[PDB]
Design a binder for this molecule. Structure first.
Ligand SMILES: [Zn+2]
Ligand SMILES: [Zn+2]
Ligand SMILES: [Zn+2]
Length: 178
């Protein structure tokens, strides 16, 4: 196995995947690494198994159809993985915890959102459809863009949204277009 966490790339107290070489800190993995389970397969392995069990699940889909899906186990899992993929980029540190807003010439968003709040919402099964999770994810970056205006710090929002959107199209097998 790897000697660093796959998500945050740091050493420490790591839990090792039994079906691939990846390793994780307890609360870096989503869901948090399970108490027992021998052997244990990580989220990457579990997502791979879904695809292998239903090869056709990789044929192209319409975003509109994906967003209306109910958060049954497999969609719950895919959303956990997509969130994990955002946390894997170091730039996610800017969006992880609860933000605050006091900048001259700007007003805070009406509905603040951050990655840890989405993490909790997923953990407590608060979303009934994929749409709920994707809306909150996109809100994080949209709140950022609006608040930071012409400061070049706005680009952090663009960069992390691009990671989200690429991984969304990949995980949910969205039909490729120009
Ligand atoms: Zn970690
Ligand atoms: Zn694995
Ligand atoms: Zn099948």
């Amino acid at each position: 196995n790897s000697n660093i966490c796959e998500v945050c790339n740091k050493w420490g107290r790591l839990f090792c995947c039994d079906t691939c070489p990846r390793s994780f800190h307890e609360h870096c993995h989503i869901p948090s690494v399970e108490a027992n389970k021998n052997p244990w397969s990580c989220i990457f392995c579990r997502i791979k198994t879904i695809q292998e069990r239903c090869p056709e699940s990789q044929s192209g889909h319409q975003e509109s159809e994906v967003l209306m899906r109910q958060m049954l186990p497999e969609e719950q899992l895919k959303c956990e993985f997509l969130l994990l993929k955002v946390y894997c980029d170091s730039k996610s540190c800017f969006f992880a915890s609860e933000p605050y807003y006091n900048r001259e010439g700007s007003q805070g968003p009406q509905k603040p959102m951050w990655l840890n709040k989405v993490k909790t919402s997923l953990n407590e099964q608060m979303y009934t459809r994929v749409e709920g999770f994707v809306q909150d994810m996109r809100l994080i970056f949209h709140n950022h863009k609006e608040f930071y205006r012409e400061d070049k710090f706005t680009r952090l929002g663009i960069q992390v949204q691009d990671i989200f959107e690429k991984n969304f199209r990949n995980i949910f097998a969205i039909q490729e277009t120009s």
